Design a protein around this ligand. Structure first.
Ligand SMILES: CC(C)(CO)NS(=O)(=O)c1ccc(NC(=O)[C@H](Cc2ccccc2)NC(=O)c2ccc(F)cc2)cc1
Ligand SMILES: CC(C)(CO)NS(=O)(=O)c1ccc(NC(=O)[C@H](Cc2ccccc2)NC(=O)c2ccc(F)cc2)cc1
Lengths: 251, 252
């Protein structure tokens, strides 16, 4: 068992994401290699690792004291919080999640630039009849896509599936469809092993966020965390879930 | 920690505080002003304001209006014109300070672009199919030589006046082509954004944080939302999604 975290009104995504991040030991190690946000984040993550209930108001307070208006983030996609944490951890340095793309632009002449991202955000493609939605199809659809190729892969990989779509009328909707994912995922040139899965439940304006993650030691027994409620979980329960964020580590 | 000081609103100076926060996010402009003021005036007071803004203090931009009064400008006329015109009234008067100088008369400011030598690249917004900055650049007597500090003015005012609301894509890196090595690459330093109807004075600047004293001359990754006295952080996605009015870029 791992400690749970309490909900401060709406906190569910933050504690789901903290539970996911604690299941990334290289990210933990890099924080160890590093009041400032990195140390609070390490304290939160090391407490959620290493096998009562906890409180992560310290994270909200260090963010606010850095003049971040967190109450405007419940109106955005949950994933933008993750991008804020990684972008603020890079401010303390100047990266375990960093993926790096080499892009070429042309229209006579060409120009090769470099771009960096904290995760891989994949559009959920339309399901054709007779073939289920797989994460390899989304990854291939994101790779196919001014060109862009992956030229540096991260040690810890975050994969965000854009479950929040927007109609042509401008009104938003949640894609409920299930994407098949395996715990062993080979990125086409490296190989990665699944560590945690953040899932969303209910309508889009509900904040019901839940994390499946591995037990701390790499271990083999999965855990379901919804705030204070922590229990044992099977792998088929993890793989049958409707994934929103996937946290992998390089094998 | 990593914040900038805010500014006050005297009547309606909200665009002016927006422009000052945008202009102090260009380090090459501040270096040019530090060199031009070694003569010894708009350049001296403007550099004082910009050097203060790029560092919970709040400063008084009132002094800028005063030197705008001492250089024989009407000021109060600017409420009946487009906001960007005040920028021209800055740059033109700086060029007027270039002439009549026996010390630094060949020291041109970093915003000048050759076509004619102009102060900023004004682009008219077409209609459509999302709008992107490259569509506006393609719709643009072409550019001849590119400035060190680049200002892009998007024509949100069309004509009886009309406010254009449509969002246009812009990127943190922007490359512009010319014949040979003349074309150049720029990085986004600040975004001035308009809100509300065309006569609302609501202007907001998204600007990068000042460089740290542990890594000087290294550009920060953090962005700030600035509305007069109110300064807060802002994510990158918030900056890239805003209906931009002015785009301040620096040559990389
Ligand atoms: C509360 C606080 C901001 C601190 O006060 N922190 S938080 O708990 O981490 C935190 C809590 C909630 C959110 N947002 C949401 O749930 C949005 C809310 C939302 C819904 C529609 C349009 C914009 C915003 N929907 C999702 O993301 C979502 C993701 C996948 C889905 F399939 C369906 C929905 C973000 C962060
Ligand atoms: C001297 C003083 C301190 C006081 O004026 N200057 S100031 O504060 O910097 C200063 C403050 C405001 C303005 N202009 C406006 O609001 C015009 C007002 C206006 C509107 C229609 C026709 C003529 C004039 N609208 C804009 O530009 C505008 C830009 C982009 C948009 F999508 C929508 C509107 C100019 C200057």
């Amino acid at each position: 068992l791992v400690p749970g975290l309490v909900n401060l009104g709406n906190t569910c995504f933050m504690n789901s994401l903290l539970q996911g991040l604690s299941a990334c030991p290289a990210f933990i190690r890099w924080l160890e290699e590093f009041q400032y946000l990195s140390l609070t984040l390490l304290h939160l993550l090391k407490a959620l690792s290493c096998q009562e209930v906890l409180d992560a108001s310290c994270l909200l307070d260090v963010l606010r004291m850095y003049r971040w208006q967190i109450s405007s983030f419940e109106e955005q996609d949950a994933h933008e919080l993750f991008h804020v944490i990684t972008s603020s951890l890079e401010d303390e340095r100047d990266h375990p999640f960093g993926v790096e793309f080499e892009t070429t632009m042309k229209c006579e002449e060409v120009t090769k630039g470099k771009e960096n991202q904290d995760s891989l955000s994949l559009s959920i493609p339309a399901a054709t009849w007779g073939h289920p939605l797989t994460l390899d199809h989304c990854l291939h659809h994101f790779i196919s896509q001014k060109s862009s190729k992956i030229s540096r892969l991260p040690q810890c990989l975050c994969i965000h599936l854009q479950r929040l779509s927007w109609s042509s009328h401008g009104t938003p909707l949640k894609r409920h469809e299930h994407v098949q994912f395996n715990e062993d995922l080979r990125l086409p040139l490296q190989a990665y092993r699944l560590m945690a899965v953040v899932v969303h439940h209910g309508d889009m304006h509900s904040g019901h966020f839940v994390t499946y993650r591995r037990s701390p030691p790499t271990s083999n027994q999965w855990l379901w965390v919804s705030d204070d409620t922590v229990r044992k979980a099977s792998l088929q329960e993890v793989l049958s879930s409707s994934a929103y964020l996937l946290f992998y580590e390089r094998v």
